[PDB]
Every structure is written in structure tokens, then in C-alpha cells.
Amino acid sequence: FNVAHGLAWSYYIGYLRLILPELQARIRTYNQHYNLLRGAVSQRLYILLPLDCGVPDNLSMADPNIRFLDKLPQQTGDHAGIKDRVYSNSIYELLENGQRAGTCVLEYATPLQTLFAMSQFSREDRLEQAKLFCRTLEDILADAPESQNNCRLIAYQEPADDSSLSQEVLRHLRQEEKE
Amino acid sequence: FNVAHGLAWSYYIGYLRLILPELQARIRTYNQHYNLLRGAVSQRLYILLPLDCGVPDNLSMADPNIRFLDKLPQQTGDHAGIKDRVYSNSIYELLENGQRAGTCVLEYATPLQTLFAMSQFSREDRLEQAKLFCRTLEDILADAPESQNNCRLIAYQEPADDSSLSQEVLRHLRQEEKE
Numbered sequence: 001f002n003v004a005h006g007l008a009w010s011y012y013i014g015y016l017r018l019i020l021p022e023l024q025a026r027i028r029t030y031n032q033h034y035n036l037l038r039g040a041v042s043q044r045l046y047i048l049l050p051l052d053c054g055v056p057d058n059l060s061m062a063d064p065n066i067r068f069l070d071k072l073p074q075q076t077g078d079h080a081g082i083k084d085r086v087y088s089n090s091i092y093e094l095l096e097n098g099q100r101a102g103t104c105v106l107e108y109a110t111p112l113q114t115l116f117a118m119s120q121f122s123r124e125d126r127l128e129q130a131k132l133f134c135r136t137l138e139d140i141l142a143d144a145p146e147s148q149n150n151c152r153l154i155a156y157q158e159p160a161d162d163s164s165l166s167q168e169v170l171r172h173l174r175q176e177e178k179e
Numbered sequence: 180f181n182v183a184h185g186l187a188w189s190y191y192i193g194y195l196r197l198i199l200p201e202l203q204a205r206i207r208t209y210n211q212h213y214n215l216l217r218g219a220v221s222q223r224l225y226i227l228l229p230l231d232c233g234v235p236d237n238l239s240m241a242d243p244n245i246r247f248l249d250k251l252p253q254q255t256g257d258h259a260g261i262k263d264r265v266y267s268n269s270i271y272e273l274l275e276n277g278q279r280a281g282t283c284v285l286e287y288a289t290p291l292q293t294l295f296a297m298s299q300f301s302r303e304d305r306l307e308q309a310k311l312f313c314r315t316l317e318d319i320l321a322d323a324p325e326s327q328n329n330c331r332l333i334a335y336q337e338p339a340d341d342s343s344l345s346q347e348v349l350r351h352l353r354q355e356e357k358e
């Protein structure tokens with residue numbers, strides 16, 4: 001109950017509070033200096049929350065239609081001993097019927113792999129802690145001033161290896177255009 | 180009790196497990212390509228754990244005798260959506276009587292600023308959660324295979340603004356030489 005609470009706050013306090021306020025400027029810099037009226041990167045950080053807590057230690061999205069396209073201009077800031085601590089972010093192209101249907105900054109919510117490491121608790125405890133985590137992070141980001149149409153939490157659960165994350169994400173980017 | 184548990188595991192799982200196994204190689208690369216038989220960077224990551232949980236959002240060590248000297252060769256690895264996620268680390272010179280008495284990679288344990296944010300709980304709850312955090316992290320790092328004379332946890336508490344972190348650290352680096 002509290003592991004998930006504490007991880008949400010720490011993720012917000014140790015990471016999002018630091019990268020969110022400048023994300024939208026880095027994104028416009030890319031969108032100018034680089035880059036099609038559909039291939040413009042969404043002005044939002046999209047945060048992947050596998051409910052099964054299986055966050056890959058690489059780029060594997062398992063969704064043939066989510067591909068790495070470019071890195072974002074890196075932000076640098078001093079933080080907690082580390083001079084010019086670098087903040088790396090990655091842009092992904094989203095495809096529908098083999099065509100590029102949009103583009104966004106994507107990454108996984110890494111505190112979840114700590115819940116995975118603690119269940120691999122039981123698998124049902126894993127799931128409830130992932131939900132609590134999502135619900136806490138959503139509420140933190142709601143009252144958080146650094147969070148103003150710059151952040152979307154994509155929580156999902158694939159029922160098997162053979163069962164469309166791309167479509168899910170794509171819906172969120174469509175709703176951005178129609179707004 | 181569990182916030183501190185979970186933050187220790189996440190710090191270990193989200194960060195130390197990823198940077199510790201290569202830290203000592205990055206350190207030798209510096210120690211050759213750069214750099215005095217005393218001015219060689221300690222082959223250890225030193226991790227500052229203010230028990231008061233006051234981790235600065237900058238480089239402030241408040242110890243005139245702990246100064247930024249150089250950055251470490253940055254490590255890059257794919258992780259959790261982010262391609263070539265960069266790992267930045269900073270080297271500090273340690274001074275005694277105005278002379279450089281040693282050198283080490285230093286940084287603060289950032290999960291602590293999440294305990295700070297939650298107490299600024301009461302200040303005594305803050306302190307116990309910081310201790311629990313230290314004790315959990317120490318035990319994790321003991322059975323952790325990635326952690327083999329590459330990591331030291333410096334926990335301390337300054338009683339006031341006018342009251343020697345440098346000496347504390349310096350003792351740990353001396354004990355390394357005499358071993």
C-alpha cells in the first residue's frame with residue numbers, strides 16, 4: 001500500500017518534477033530544427049505503465065508498430081552532487097497500416113520494475129500495487145503545477161504474447177489533435 | 180517502515196544495479212587518460228546520506244573542502260524506453276589544510292529528498308525512515324553481486340550550520356589505501 005505510495009511520490013519528486021517543466025520546450029526545439037504536419041512530436045510525455053510491471057531493460061515495446069525514431073534534445077541540470085546530470089528522452093513513431101500515424105516521447109515508468117522484483121508478494125499483490133501506483137501518480141500529477149497538458153499515463157495489460165499498444169497510444173495522440 | 184524499504188530497493192533496482200558493475204572501469208579510464216599518486220580517484224562510489232534528508236538540488240556540499248574537480252566518463256545504455264540513457268557522475272577533490280588529500284566519485288542518495296518532502300510525518304519520523312533506508316540499502320548492497328568494493332554509504336547528520344564531512348569522507352578513502 002505504501003511501497004506504491006512512496007514509489008509514486010519518489011518518481012514524481014525524483015524525476016517528473018525535474019523534467020516536465022522543460023519537456024515542452026525541448027519538444028518544440030526538435031519539432032522545428034527537425035521535422036510533415038502529422039509527423040510532429042506530441043507536446044506530451046507518454047508514460048507506459050505495464051500493469052504486469054514487466055518493464056524491459058531495453059527498448060522492447062513488443063508492438064511492431066512502435067519504433068524508435070530519434071532522441072530528444074538532452075536537458076542538463078546540476079542535481080544532488082552530479083554536475084550536468086543529463087536527461088535523455090526518446091521519440092517513437094506510431095504506425096497504422098504500415099504508415100506513420102503520429103509521433104511521441106515515450107518511456108516506461110521504471111518504479112514498476114521494483115514491484116516486479118518483489119513479486120516474481122504474489123502476482124495479484126503485484127497487480128494491486130501497480131494500480132495503487134498509477135492512481136497515486138495520477139493524483140500527484142493533477143495537483144502538481146509542473147504537470148499541465150505535458151504528461152499522460154498509459155496503463156495497460158497484455159493478456160498474452162499473442163493477443164495493440166500502438167492503437168492505445170495513437171488514440172491519446174488523436175484526442176490531443178482534436179483539442 | 181515500508182516507504183523506506185521500497186525506496187531502498189528501487190534505488191538499488193533502478194539505479195545502483197545499473198551503474199555499479201561498470202563504475203570501476205569508467206574510473207580506471209579517467210585515472211589513466213586523466214591524472215599525482217594521491218590525486219587518483221577512489222575506485223568506489225561514495226553515496227552521501229544526510230540523515231536530515233536535506234539533499235540539495237545542486238552541487239552544494241556545504242564543506243568548503245569538498246570541491247567539484249571533473250566529471251567521470253559517461254556511461255550510456257538503453258533502459259526502459261530511453262535509447263542511450265546517459266549516466267553522469269561527478270568527481271570531487273577532498274582538501275585538508277588547503278592541500279588536496281584525495282579524490283572520489285560522490286553523490287547524494289536522492290530517494291532521501293522524498294522522505295524530506297514527506298516530513299517538512301514529523302521530523303523524528305523523517306530520521307527513523309532515513310535510518311531504515313540506510314540499513315536496508317546497506318543490506319541489499321551486501322548480498323548484491325554488483326556490489327563488491329565499489330560502493331560506500333556515507334550517512335551523517337550535521338547538528339547545525341556552524342558545527343567536517345570532508346574529514347569523514349577522507350577517513351573512508353584513507354582506509355581504502357590501507358587495504
Ligand SMILES: CC[C@H](CC(=O)c1cc2cc(OC)c(OC)cc2[se]1)C(=O)O
Nearest residue numbers: 010011014015110111258259261289290
Ligand atoms: C528510464 C528513465 C528513468 C527516469 C529517471 O531517470 C529517474 C527515475 C527516478 C525514480 C525515483 O524514485 C522512483 C527517484 O527517486 C529519487 C529518482 C529517479 Se531519476 C530511469 O529510471 O532511468
Ligand SMILES: CC[C@H](CC(=O)c1cc2cc(OC)c(OC)cc2[se]1)C(=O)O
Nearest residue numbers: 079080082110111189190193194289290
Ligand atoms: C543524482 C543522480 C540520481 C541517480 C539516478 O539517476 C536514479 C535514481 C533512481 C531511484 C529510483 O528509485 C529510488 C528509481 O526507481 C526506478 C530509478 C532511479 Se535512476 C538522480 O536521482 O537523478
